[PDB]
Amino acid sequence: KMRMPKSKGATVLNLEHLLEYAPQQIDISNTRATQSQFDTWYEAVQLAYDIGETEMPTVMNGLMVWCIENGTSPNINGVWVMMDGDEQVEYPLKPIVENAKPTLRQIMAHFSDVAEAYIEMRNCKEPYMPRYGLVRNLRDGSLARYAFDFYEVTSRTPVRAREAHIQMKA
Amino acid sequence: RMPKSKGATVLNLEHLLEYAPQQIDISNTRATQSQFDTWYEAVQLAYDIGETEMPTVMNGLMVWCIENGTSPNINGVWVMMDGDEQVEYPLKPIVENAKPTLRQIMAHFSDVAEAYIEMRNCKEPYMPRYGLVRNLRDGSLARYAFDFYEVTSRTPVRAREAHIQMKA
Amino acid sequence: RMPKSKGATVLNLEHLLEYAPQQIDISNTRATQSQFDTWYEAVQLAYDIGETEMPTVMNGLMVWCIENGTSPNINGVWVMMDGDEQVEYPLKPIVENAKPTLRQIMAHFSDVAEAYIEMRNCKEPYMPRYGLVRNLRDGSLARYAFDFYEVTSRTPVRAREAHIQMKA
Amino acid sequence: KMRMPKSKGATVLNLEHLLEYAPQQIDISNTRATQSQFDTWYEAVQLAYDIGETEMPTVMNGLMVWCIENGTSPNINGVWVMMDGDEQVEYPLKPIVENAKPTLRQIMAHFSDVAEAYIEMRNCKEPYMPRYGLVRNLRDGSLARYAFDFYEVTSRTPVRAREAHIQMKA
Amino acid sequence: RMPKSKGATVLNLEHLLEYAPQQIDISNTRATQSQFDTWYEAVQLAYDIGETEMPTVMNGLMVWCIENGTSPNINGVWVMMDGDEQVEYPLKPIVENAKPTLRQIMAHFSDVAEAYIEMRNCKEPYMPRYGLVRNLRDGSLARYAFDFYEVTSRTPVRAREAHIQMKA
Numbered sequence: 005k006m007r008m009p010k011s012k013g014a015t016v017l018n019l020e021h022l023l024e025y026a027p028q029q030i031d032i033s034n035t036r037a038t039q040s041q042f043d044t045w046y047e048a049v050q051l052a053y054d055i056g057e058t059e060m061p062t063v064m065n066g067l068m069v070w071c072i073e074n075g076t077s078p079n080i081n082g083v084w085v086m087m088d089g090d091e092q093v094e095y096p097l098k099p100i101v102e103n104a105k106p107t108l109r110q111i112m113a114h115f116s117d118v119a120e121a122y123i124e125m126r127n128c129k130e131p132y133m134p135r136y137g138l139v140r141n142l143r144d145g146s147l148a149r150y151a152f153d154f155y156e157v158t159s160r161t162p163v164r165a166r167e168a169h170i171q172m173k174a
Numbered sequence: 175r176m177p178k179s180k181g182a183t184v185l186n187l188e189h190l191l192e193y194a195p196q197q198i199d200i201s202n203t204r205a206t207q208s209q210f211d212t213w214y215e216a217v218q219l220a221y222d223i224g225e226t227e228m229p230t231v232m233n234g235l236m237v238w239c240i241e242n243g244t245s246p247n248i249n250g251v252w253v254m255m256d257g258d259e260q261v262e263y264p265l266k267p268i269v270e271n272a273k274p275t276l277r278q279i280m281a282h283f284s285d286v287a288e289a290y291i292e293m294r295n296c297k298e299p300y301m302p303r304y305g306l307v308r309n310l311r312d313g314s315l316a317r318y319a320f321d322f323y324e325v326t327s328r329t330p331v332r333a334r335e336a337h338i339q340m341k342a
Numbered sequence: 343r344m345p346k347s348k349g350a351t352v353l354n355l356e357h358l359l360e361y362a363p364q365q366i367d368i369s370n371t372r373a374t375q376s377q378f379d380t381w382y383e384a385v386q387l388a389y390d391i392g393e394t395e396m397p398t399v400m401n402g403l404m405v406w407c408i409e410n411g412t413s414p415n416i417n418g419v420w421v422m423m424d425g426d427e428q429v430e431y432p433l434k435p436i437v438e439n440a441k442p443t444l445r446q447i448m449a450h451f452s453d454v455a456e457a458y459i460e461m462r463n464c465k466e467p468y469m470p471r472y473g474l475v476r477n478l479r480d481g482s483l484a485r486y487a488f489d490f491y492e493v494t495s496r497t498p499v500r501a502r503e504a505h506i507q508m509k510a
Numbered sequence: 511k512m513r514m515p516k517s518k519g520a521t522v523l524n525l526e527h528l529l530e531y532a533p534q535q536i537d538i539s540n541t542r543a544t545q546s547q548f549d550t551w552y553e554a555v556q557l558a559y560d561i562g563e564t565e566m567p568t569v570m571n572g573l574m575v576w577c578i579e580n581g582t583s584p585n586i587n588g589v590w591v592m593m594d595g596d597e598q599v600e601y602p603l604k605p606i607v608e609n610a611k612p613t614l615r616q617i618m619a620h621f622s623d624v625a626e627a628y629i630e631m632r633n634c635k636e637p638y639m640p641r642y643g644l645v646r647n648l649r650d651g652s653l654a655r656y657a658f659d660f661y662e663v664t665s666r667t668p669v670r671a672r673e674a675h676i677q678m679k680a
Numbered sequence: 681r682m683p684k685s686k687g688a689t690v691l692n693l694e695h696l697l698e699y700a701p702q703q704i705d706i707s708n709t710r711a712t713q714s715q716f717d718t719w720y721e722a723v724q725l726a727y728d729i730g731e732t733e734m735p736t737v738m739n740g741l742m743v744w745c746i747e748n749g750t751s752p753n754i755n756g757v758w759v760m761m762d763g764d765e766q767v768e769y770p771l772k773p774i775v776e777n778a779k780p781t782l783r784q785i786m787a788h789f790s791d792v793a794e795a796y797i798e799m800r801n802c803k804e805p806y807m808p809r810y811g812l813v814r815n816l817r818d819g820s821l822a823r824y825a826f827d828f829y830e831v832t833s834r835t836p837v838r839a840r841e842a843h844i845q846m847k848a
Contacts, residue, residue: 005465005530005532006285006286006289006461006464006465006529007198007285008285008286008529008530009210009232009282009283009286011210011211011214011215012211014225015229015526016214016228016229016232017229017232017233017236017283017286018229018230018232018233019525019526019529020521020525021229021230021233022233022286022290023293023512023514023525024511024514025233025234025237025255026294026511027234027237027254027255028255029241029303031253031255031260032234032237032238032241032242032252032253032254032255033241033242033303034242034246035303038251038253038260038262039260040260040262106247106250157306157307158306159299159300159301159306161306163311166306166309170309288464289461289464292460293457293512296456296457296512297496297511297512328465366513378515378517379517379518382517382522383517393520396522397521397522397523397524397527398524398527400515400522400523400524401523401524401527401528401531402531402533402538404523405531405533405538406538409535409538409539410538410539410540414540415612418612419544420538421537421538421544422533422538423531423533423534423537423538428537428544428545428546430544430546450515451515451523453512453513453514454512454514454515454523454528457512458528461529462532467665468665469665471535471539471541474663474664474665474667474672475663477672477676479669536681545685548683548685549685549686552685552690553685566690567689567690567691567692567695568692568695570683570690570691571691571692571695571696571699572699574691574696575699575701575706576706579703579706579707580706580707580708584708588708588780589712591705591706591712592701592706593699593701593702593705593706598705598712598713598714600712600714620683621683621691623681623682624682624683624691624696628696631697632700635700636833637833637834638703638833639833641703641707641709641831644831644832644833644835644840645831647840647844649837
């Protein structure tokens, strides 16, 4: 029979709750930073950039698209750019990386679902393979919604996509 | 040729005939009960939690160590979900007091972890992240996809081969 | 062509779009909650047992009705094992108060019965006697081998074929 | 997710005990009479036969071997015989059948394990196919330990034996 | 799992090991000795014959019931040949006192009937009329061609198949 864990003759697990405890893999995964680590980061960039509680969403839109075509391991001393119409708005990367615990990739993994959605609509007008796949010989175009560094391989990910990431990685 | 010292065996074949310890109680792949109790009673004190809800916390920790592993960052935190909310706990007591290794201390959950990784496969496919990261493509072996599994004589040969594949 | 009486639909498509009842809550293959509560609260009174140990009795009854069936002899007794000892209970409250049929009242255990018929297959092969009497030779379908299983949209086609084989 | 049974918001099952409740199939099966129904029968035959608390075992040995070679549905008005050396000791069947609840087959199913053991040793000297298989064209000799009316098909029974019983039955 | 009532087996395995009754003494296909004696001592009285010549009469009756059968007309007569002459006897005592059935009472002659149906095959072919009427075309199975044969573990498979052919 199964040998349930016991300390001093008492099961150390609650079975009424284990049967009804089905966490989504992403919530307890370690490829994504905790929402308590995202909130600290998010608020930190609002403080460094002096952007108000409004307009931050639009700065996060530039970073998301910027982090798809550039990567989530940039230089702490550089500047990421977002297009304000036709011009170029450069922001410092120090708050982005200095306050990204444990790493920016895990902080940016919160955008994974939106990231693939953004690529599809972009790909729904003309070809758009994110640079993370162009500099890694990702040639199939259908698997272009998974060509970004901060993608979270979950139980719902196509197996191909999973194999492709094994290819882009090294 | 029975062992002997001074014209007397140094064994009792009466006892032995009926001495049959299960492999998971003699094996070193799993911490001793005295070690498990010490770890459990130290995590209980370090978390300011009583017996009323400590078992509930252990449900989350097991489910975390199925999806993350038994070699985490000591200066970190393990996550539990209280519904849609997130519950964060330190990993200092978990790793500091888990002698010899947290895997040996978590090997006591091998049977329950096996149940919960198939109890969540019913209804919908589910696969731990110790198999999704280690390139496992067979759902029938999802039961055995966690670091602290106890390989015994009852393990399927196919299961005992996924582990050497995932472990390398 | 939407139904109508007097120039007005007799339906609300707003509601409907988001009205999605699970099949095992609308289906008649399973007794209603008000019927389950009446049966449970009648068996509890007819057995001189409180909430402290009534759940324990229900563990035995489910395991009996997996191995015997849901059409027993009303003037009989269902057996429970308190270790090596035998515990005998009447089947008058079980069948008398189970409206409409005990199978509908036992259909609420279809999910748990499925778990327990696979939770006892781990470790050692196990097969209910509603499959050993109805000529079933495949252990992979042992989960679905009990009278009060609830056939839903999630039932495997192979499982949904064993039942029509066992049911005839 | 699994929908555990509930009455008024409380599970009607104890999960700490269900995981550790693995009854042997025979103990809760209905092909075997309850030990409370065997004890009543057993004691009844001791009262009808006037045999003491000793010597009943030897009368149960004749009935077991008699019920292998004859059947467990005899005439209530007959007499079953056991061999006392070379002679023939006839006993009335009224207490055997009148006090066999629900039926003698279920009362005699308590001897199933011994019954097959008895045949093997009998078959370990010379061929012995119980009459229940001779009058039913049971031709294979290895499956002669399952040729008796009160056999309990369990999870440990060979599948052949199971198919054979389907053949002897009708 | 030995049977038991109150923590004591209800069997003696000492005795059993050496309890080995022949099948034709426990089987119900053949009348008990007390029944045979009652029938024999009733036919003896109903025929006004002593022990001096009763065995001779039984020689004819066995040879009749090999050629006619064990289900005759009670209000009839069975024939014996005293050379070229005919000897007629009633069948009232034969059938009336043969409990439970005359076949069970005549099963005691299965061994002798087998001898006499082969002892008359030596020299010249001979076949009972329970085989000539039931379409049997093999002389090697003439031994087993009578109603009151006792099918035992020693019966040839071919012989045990003629009977089911002749019996249908």
